[PDB]
Amino acid sequence: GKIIRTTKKVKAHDENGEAGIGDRVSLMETRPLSATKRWRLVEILEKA
Amino acid sequence: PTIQQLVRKGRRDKIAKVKTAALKGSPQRRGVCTRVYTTTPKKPNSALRKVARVKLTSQVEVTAYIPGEGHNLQEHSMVLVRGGRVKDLPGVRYKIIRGSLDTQGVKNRKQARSRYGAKKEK
Amino acid sequence: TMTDPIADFLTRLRNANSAYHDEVTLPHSKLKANIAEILKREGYISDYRTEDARVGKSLVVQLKYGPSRERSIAGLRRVSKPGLRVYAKSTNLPRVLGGLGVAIISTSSGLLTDRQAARQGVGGEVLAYVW
RNA sequence: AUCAGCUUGUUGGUGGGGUGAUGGCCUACCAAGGCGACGACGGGUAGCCGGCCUGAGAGGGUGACCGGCCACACUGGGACUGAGAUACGGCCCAGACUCCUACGGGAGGCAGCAGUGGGGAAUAUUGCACAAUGGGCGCAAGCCUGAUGCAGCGACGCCGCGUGAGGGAUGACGGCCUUCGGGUUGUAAACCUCUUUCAGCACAGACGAAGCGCAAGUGACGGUAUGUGCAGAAGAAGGACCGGCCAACUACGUGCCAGCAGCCGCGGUAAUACGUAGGGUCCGAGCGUUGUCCGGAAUUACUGGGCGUAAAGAGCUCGUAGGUGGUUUGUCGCGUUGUUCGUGAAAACUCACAGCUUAACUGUGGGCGUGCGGGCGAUACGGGCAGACUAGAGUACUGCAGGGGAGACUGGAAUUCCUGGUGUAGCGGUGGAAUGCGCAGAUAUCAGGAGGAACACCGGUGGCGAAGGCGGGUCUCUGGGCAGUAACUGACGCUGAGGAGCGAAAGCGUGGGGAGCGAACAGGAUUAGAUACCCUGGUAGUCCACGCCGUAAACGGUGGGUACUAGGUGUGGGUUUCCUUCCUUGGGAUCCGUGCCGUAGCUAACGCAUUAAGUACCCCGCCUGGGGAGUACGGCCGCAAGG
RNA sequence: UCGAAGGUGGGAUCGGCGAUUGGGACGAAGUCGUAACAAGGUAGCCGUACCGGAAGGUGCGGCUGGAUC
Ligand SMILES: [Mg+2]
Ligand SMILES: [Mg+2]
Ligand SMILES: [Mg+2]
Ligand SMILES: [Mg+2]
Ligand SMILES: [Mg+2]
Ligand SMILES: [Mg+2]
Ligand SMILES: [Mg+2]
Ligand SMILES: [Mg+2]
Ligand SMILES: [Mg+2]
Ligand SMILES: [Mg+2]
Ligand SMILES: [Mg+2]
Ligand SMILES: [Mg+2]
Ligand SMILES: [Mg+2]
Ligand SMILES: [Mg+2]
Ligand SMILES: [Mg+2]
Ligand SMILES: [Mg+2]
Ligand SMILES: [Mg+2]
Ligand SMILES: [Mg+2]
Ligand SMILES: [Mg+2]
Ligand SMILES: [Mg+2]
Ligand SMILES: [Mg+2]
Ligand SMILES: [Mg+2]
Ligand SMILES: [Mg+2]
Ligand SMILES: [Mg+2]
Ligand SMILES: [Mg+2]
Ligand SMILES: [Mg+2]
Ligand SMILES: [Mg+2]
Ligand SMILES: [Mg+2]
Ligand SMILES: [Mg+2]
Ligand SMILES: [Mg+2]
Ligand SMILES: [Mg+2]
Ligand SMILES: [Mg+2]
Ligand SMILES: [Mg+2]
Ligand SMILES: [Mg+2]
Ligand SMILES: [Mg+2]
Ligand SMILES: [Mg+2]
Ligand SMILES: [Mg+2]
Ligand SMILES: [Mg+2]
Ligand SMILES: [Mg+2]
Ligand SMILES: [Mg+2]
Ligand SMILES: [Mg+2]
Ligand SMILES: [Mg+2]
Ligand SMILES: [Mg+2]
Ligand SMILES: [Mg+2]
Ligand SMILES: [Mg+2]
Ligand SMILES: [Mg+2]
Ligand SMILES: [Mg+2]
Ligand SMILES: [Mg+2]
Ligand SMILES: [Mg+2]
Ligand SMILES: [Mg+2]
Ligand SMILES: [Mg+2]
Ligand SMILES: [Mg+2]
Ligand SMILES: [Mg+2]
Ligand SMILES: [Mg+2]
Ligand SMILES: [Mg+2]
Ligand SMILES: [Mg+2]
Ligand SMILES: [Mg+2]
Ligand SMILES: [Mg+2]
Ligand SMILES: [Mg+2]
Ligand SMILES: [Mg+2]
Ligand SMILES: [Mg+2]
Ligand SMILES: [Mg+2]
Ligand SMILES: [Mg+2]
Ligand SMILES: [Mg+2]
Ligand SMILES: [Mg+2]
Ligand SMILES: [Mg+2]
Ligand SMILES: [Mg+2]
Ligand SMILES: [Mg+2]
Ligand SMILES: [Mg+2]
Ligand SMILES: [Mg+2]
Ligand SMILES: [Mg+2]
Ligand SMILES: [Mg+2]
Ligand SMILES: [Mg+2]
Ligand SMILES: [Mg+2]
Ligand SMILES: [Mg+2]
Ligand SMILES: [Mg+2]
Ligand SMILES: [Mg+2]
Ligand SMILES: [Mg+2]
Ligand SMILES: [Mg+2]
Ligand SMILES: [Mg+2]
Ligand SMILES: [Mg+2]
Ligand SMILES: [Mg+2]
Ligand SMILES: [Mg+2]
Ligand SMILES: [Mg+2]
Ligand SMILES: [Mg+2]
Ligand SMILES: [Mg+2]
Ligand SMILES: [Mg+2]
Ligand SMILES: [Mg+2]
Ligand SMILES: [Mg+2]
Ligand SMILES: [Mg+2]
Ligand SMILES: [Mg+2]
Ligand SMILES: [Mg+2]
Ligand SMILES: [Mg+2]
Ligand SMILES: [Mg+2]
Ligand SMILES: [Mg+2]
Ligand SMILES: [Mg+2]
Ligand SMILES: [Mg+2]
Ligand SMILES: [Mg+2]
Ligand SMILES: [Mg+2]
Ligand SMILES: [Mg+2]
Ligand SMILES: [Mg+2]
Ligand SMILES: [Mg+2]
Ligand SMILES: [Mg+2]
Ligand SMILES: [Mg+2]
C-alpha cells in the first residue's frame, strides 16, 4: 500500500528534431512507425 | 527494514522442507522389494525391527518398515508402499500397507482390524 | 535531521504528557497552528496561543490536568508519514478507539474531524490517531 | 547476478515494393547508435482471467467443473480456396511407426463419442433418441447433428431417507471383575399391542409439446418419476479411539523379547502407552491411513518483529544515482480528495422473494457485480512550476585547548658487543638440579667507543581523531573541533544500494638494517608418557623505504542525523557578571567534551537511564531452529598465503 | 531468392556413471589422551603465522563474557 514512484521510457516521432535535452513535451498515440515506437510529438511547451 | 528497502528488494517467503520426496507428492507407489533384514533402534529404544529395501517405479531406492507381528515377504515380491515416518529407525520414512498385492493381513487381529487388513469373523 | 514537524510536535506533546509538564514551546507553522486549533475544538488540550521569539513566531501549548492528576491524553501515533503515506476514501474512514478517539483528516475544506467528515461524505489523508 | 552488458535490419530518416489497413512488413541509399543497475540480455518453471480453499482483514495457496480468450492437432515446414485457415476427420513435402501386395505399388493419424494394450493408486458403457433446445441445408415438407436430452457402472463429493417402536423388574440367561457382600453388559432382552416408510407384488399413470404438419399424428427417457391397493417388524451396520496433549479403563498373555507411536515418549516379571478380552468414547453408510494447500506461524511482522549479551550494525569515512527537507512572503492544479451522468459480459459470492411434498436440483425478478473510461462542479495537506525572507547549514571577525598527521634535526638512561685496567674461582638459573660460560682469566667493577629499538616520571578511567590508533624534545607545513559578534549566501540539509579511499597484528616481493625480544629447531628437567607448561641457546619476524592481503571479542558485542523528557557528584576548554580582597575550584549565567550513581520509562532478566536500550521522525546494512557451512562449485581481487 | 529435414566443426548448460581420494553425520564400546567449564591446576577468547598422531602449544596485537590484592 506504500506509494512507489516508477518511470518508463517511451520514444516518439518528431519531424524536425526541435527538442533538446531536458525538456518536457506532450505526446499522442499513433499508428506503428517502426519497432518499439508507436507515438508522435504534440508540441514543445518549454525549452531548457 | 525501511520502506525504500522493501520497495527495492521485496521479501522472499520461506521454502518448505519437503518430506518423503521419493513420492514426488504422490501418496502411494507400487514397488518390488530387493532384500529383507532387521535393524536396531537408537539409544532410548532397544528392539529388533523389520525393514525392507524396495525398488520404486520412480527408480528411487528407499527403506520400508513392515508393521504387524508376521509377514511373508521374500525377495522379488510385489509390494504396495505408502508414506510414514518412524522415530527409532534413523533413515526410514515409509511404511508398508497391509492387505494389498502379495502381502496379506496378519492373522489373529480383531481390534484395530481395518488398519492391518483383517476380514470380518462370522 | 529535522524532517517531520508534525511527528515532532506529536512526540513532544505526548512526551510532555508523560513527564507531567505544563507548557511546551515549539517553532510555529500553519500545520502546527491549525492542528492545535482542532485539538482545542475537540477539547483534548487546554489552550494555545502564539508568541514571538528571537527569530520567528513560536506557539505554546498548555496541557490539561484534572483534580485527580490522571492523564488527559492516553496515547498518540502517526499513520501517514513521509514514505508510507496512507489515505482514506469516502467510505473507508478509519475507526479509532472504537469511535471514542479522533482521527485528523485533511479534506477539501481542511483539517477536520472524522465524524463530521463522514457526515459530509468527504475524506482524505489521516494525520494521526489521538485517543 | 552463483545471469552485466545486449543488438547489426539493430536503431533512425528518405525513396521504392508490400498488405484490407499504417508500419524495417521487405529492398536500396544516408547517420551511429537504441536498449541497459527505477534490473536489459541470459537461466528454470508455467496457459491467462471471472472463480475455489484458507484467513476477521491484509495476505497466502491454487486454476477441479462451468464460462471469456489464448495456442496445438504424430514431429517440422509451406501454400491454394474462401467475406472469413494453427485449415483437427482439407492439400503438398521430409521424417518415425503401422498395415495390404499377386513385389510392379499404395493407405493411415481417437488430445471426437465409446473401447483395447502400457504406466499407474485409480477413475465408467464398444447404451437409446433427434422428444425438447442450439447448428447446417432447403420456398416448405423433410434430412443430418456421440452438440444435446437420457439411461448403465463407481459410498468419490454437497443433500434427504431406511435397519422401529409405547410399556415392561429395586432389573431373567451368559460374559467380565470382586474385597466373594456383590457390581457390570441393561429398557438392553424375551414379552403384549402399533404403524409398517423404502425396497417386494399389482392398477392407474403424467407434464416436459399455445411446439411441427395441413396433416390425422408426433416422448428415447418410460410404461420410469407420481398417486391408488396387498402381505408381513417382516430385507437391512459398521469403522476408529480410550498415558498427557485429547470427550473414552480394568482384567488376562509375554518382559530391553515380541511390539506402539503426530510431540513428549512406552515393556530390564506384577504395562490404564505391547497383544487378547470385555467395558466406554467419537463418528456413521461411511469410518481411518496417506499426499498436496491455508490458518494457528506476529515463524518473512505494511497493518504487525528485532540487532548489548540468544541471529544480526559492514572497520570506519568521502561521496555518484536514488530517498527524504529549517519560516513566511505568489499562479497553473500534473501527488489528491470535492459531486454528478457515464462502464463494471454472463456466471459466483452476500441480502430478500419464490418453485420442485422438504433434499440435492433448478423456476422468476431484483440485488451483488469491491476496477476502469469521458463531460460538469472544489483547493486544506501531500509535488513541479512562476517571486522574497532565515530558526537547519555554511562563510565572515576575534580567541581557544589538544599524544591529530608527515618530513628533518637532536637528548638522556638502559641492554649487548668490543678495547684497556683491577680483581679472584666460580657466574647464570628454578619447586630442586643439569645442559650454558669460565681457570686460555668468567662474574663483579672503572674508563672509552660502537650500533639498534623504545621514550620510564607528567601518564589519569584525562586529550584528540571518523575508526583503526595516537604521546623524549625542536623546527617546518597542514587537518578537525569549540565560544562570542551574529556581516553575508538564502532550501544549499539528511542518510546513502551498487562504486571508490583509509585501516590492529601477522604474512609476501625487492633492497637495507637488525641491541633487546621472540614462532620454528636442538639439547637439559618432570611425568608411565610431553612432539607443552620450566631452563639454556636462537633462525624468520619484530626496524626502514616502496608495494601488496584487507581480515580482529574492528566491543559501547548498540549506524548516522534531528527535536523533546526529572537530578546529584568530578574533569577539560572558552566566554560573561557579581560578594569583590577584586588574590579565591569565591558565587552566578552560558555552550562543547568526557567519568559515576540514580527517577518516570523500557526490557524476559542482568541492566540502559539526556553521551538512552526512553518516547518519535528520515534513510542504510544485517537475522528467520542447531549441524552441515562461512564449506564445495561458479564469479571477482590478490604473485601466493589467501580474501 | 527464401526455405524444413540431413551433415559437417568447435564453444555453453543440464546432467548420469566413474577407480580412488577429501570431508560430514548418525552408531556405541574401546585405546590413546586433559582440551574447555571454579585463578580447571599455564586466565579465557578473537585475528594471524609456525609447529606437533590428537584435543592443542608458542609468537605479536586486541576485549573482559577474568578471580584474588
Ligand atoms: Mg531503528
Ligand atoms: Mg489403535
Ligand atoms: Mg491399543
Ligand atoms: Mg518506406
Ligand atoms: Mg505514407
Ligand atoms: Mg515495419
Ligand atoms: Mg528502403
Ligand atoms: Mg480476483
Ligand atoms: Mg486473515
Ligand atoms: Mg495472513
Ligand atoms: Mg491463477
Ligand atoms: Mg464456455
Ligand atoms: Mg478479445
Ligand atoms: Mg503442428
Ligand atoms: Mg504446428
Ligand atoms: Mg495447420
Ligand atoms: Mg478430425
Ligand atoms: Mg479425424
Ligand atoms: Mg493424431
Ligand atoms: Mg471421444
Ligand atoms: Mg495402467
Ligand atoms: Mg471413481
Ligand atoms: Mg433441432
Ligand atoms: Mg407448412
Ligand atoms: Mg444422412
Ligand atoms: Mg440420420
Ligand atoms: Mg447423460
Ligand atoms: Mg470406492
Ligand atoms: Mg463397492
Ligand atoms: Mg442421506
Ligand atoms: Mg416396545
Ligand atoms: Mg411408493
Ligand atoms: Mg402432453
Ligand atoms: Mg394440451
Ligand atoms: Mg411421491
Ligand atoms: Mg483417555
Ligand atoms: Mg479424554
Ligand atoms: Mg500385564
Ligand atoms: Mg465399545
Ligand atoms: Mg495448514
Ligand atoms: Mg508503520
Ligand atoms: Mg517480526
Ligand atoms: Mg547474538
Ligand atoms: Mg556487526
Ligand atoms: Mg564483517
Ligand atoms: Mg538531485
Ligand atoms: Mg482533476
Ligand atoms: Mg465523474
Ligand atoms: Mg462509475
Ligand atoms: Mg446479469
Ligand atoms: Mg462467505
Ligand atoms: Mg414452494
Ligand atoms: Mg442471484
Ligand atoms: Mg476480495
Ligand atoms: Mg520533492
Ligand atoms: Mg530583505
Ligand atoms: Mg547561518
Ligand atoms: Mg591549541
Ligand atoms: Mg613520511
Ligand atoms: Mg675491558
Ligand atoms: Mg663491563
Ligand atoms: Mg645491530
Ligand atoms: Mg541583513
Ligand atoms: Mg553533514
Ligand atoms: Mg548521502
Ligand atoms: Mg548521499
Ligand atoms: Mg549500493
Ligand atoms: Mg553500500
Ligand atoms: Mg585505492
Ligand atoms: Mg589503493
Ligand atoms: Mg607488530
Ligand atoms: Mg605490520
Ligand atoms: Mg611467509
Ligand atoms: Mg617486503
Ligand atoms: Mg630483505
Ligand atoms: Mg631469545
Ligand atoms: Mg619462548
Ligand atoms: Mg647444533
Ligand atoms: Mg624441545
Ligand atoms: Mg567480520
Ligand atoms: Mg578499536
Ligand atoms: Mg558503525
Ligand atoms: Mg538517530
Ligand atoms: Mg551538557
Ligand atoms: Mg517508574
Ligand atoms: Mg517490567
Ligand atoms: Mg539512571
Ligand atoms: Mg541519546
Ligand atoms: Mg530496541
Ligand atoms: Mg533454513
Ligand atoms: Mg564438526
Ligand atoms: Mg553458516
Ligand atoms: Mg569457483
Ligand atoms: Mg556434476
Ligand atoms: Mg561414480
Ligand atoms: Mg578413555
Ligand atoms: Mg584443563
Ligand atoms: Mg595442566
Ligand atoms: Mg585455560
Ligand atoms: Mg585456555
Ligand atoms: Mg587463531
Ligand atoms: Mg611454540
Ligand atoms: Mg594480544
Ligand atoms: Mg562471563
Q: Do C44 and C26 fall into the same domain?
A: yes
| Domain of residue C43, CATH code | 3.30.1370.30
The CA distance from C127 to C78, in Å, is 6
Closest approach of A9 to chain B, Cα-based (Å): 19
Query: Are residues B70 and B106 in contact, defined by beta-carbon separation less than 8 angstroms?
Result: yes
Q: Which three cell numbers stand for residue C12?
A: 513532544
Query: Are residues C101 and C85 in contact, defined by beta-carbon separation less than 8 angstroms?
Result: no
Handedness of CA C34, C131, C45, C17 (dihedral sign): negative
Return left, alpha or beta for B68; rule: phi > 0 is left, psi -120 to 50 is alpha, else beta. left
Domain containing residue C57? 1-73
The CA distance from B46 to B92, in Å, is 16
| Domain of residue C128, CATH code | 3.30.1490.10
Q: Which three cell numbers stand for residue C43?
A: 477539547
Residues pairing with B36 in the sheet: B52
Q: Do C69 and C26 fall into the same domain?
A: yes
- Which residues 6+ apart lie within 8 Å of B48 measured at CB? B38, B39, B40
Query: Are residues B95 and B82 in contact, defined by beta-carbon separation less than 8 angstroms?
Result: yes
Residues of chain A contacting C84 with CB distance shorter than 8 Å: 1-2
Q: Do C112 and C126 fall into the same domain?
A: yes
Residues pairing with B79 in the sheet: B31
Q: Which three cell numbers stand for residue A33?
A: 512507425
Q: Do C38 and C13 fall into the same domain?
A: yes
- Which residues 6+ apart lie within 8 Å of C58 measured at CB? C25, C26, C27, C28, C50, C51, C52
Q: Do C1 and C43 fall into the same domain?
A: yes
Q: Do C67 and C97 fall into the same domain?
A: no
Q: Which nucleotide's C1' atom has the smallest distance to the CA of B82?
A: D290
Resolution in angstrom units: 2.5
Method for structure elucidation: cryo-EM
Q: Do C9 and C58 fall into the same domain?
A: yes
Domain containing residue B87? 1-122
Q: Do C3 and C62 fall into the same domain?
A: yes
Total domains present in chain C: 2
The CA distance from A40 to A11, in Å, is 9
Residue nearest to nucleotide D322 (CA to C1'): B4
Total domains present in chain B: 1
Query: Are residues B62 and B56 in contact, defined by beta-carbon separation less than 8 angstroms?
Result: yes
- Which residues 6+ apart lie within 8 Å of C18 measured at CB? none
Subunit contact B6:A2, Cβ cutoff 8 A: yes
Residue B47 dihedral angles phi and psi, to the nearest 5°: -155, -170
Residue B22 (CA) to nucleotide D522 (C1'), in angstroms, measures 63
The CA distance from C107 to C105, in Å, is 6
Residues of chain C contacting B4 with CB distance shorter than 8 Å: 83
Subunit contact C84:B4, Cβ cutoff 8 A: no
- In the three-class reduction of DSSP (H, G, I as helix; E, B as strand; rest coil), residue C119 is classed as helix
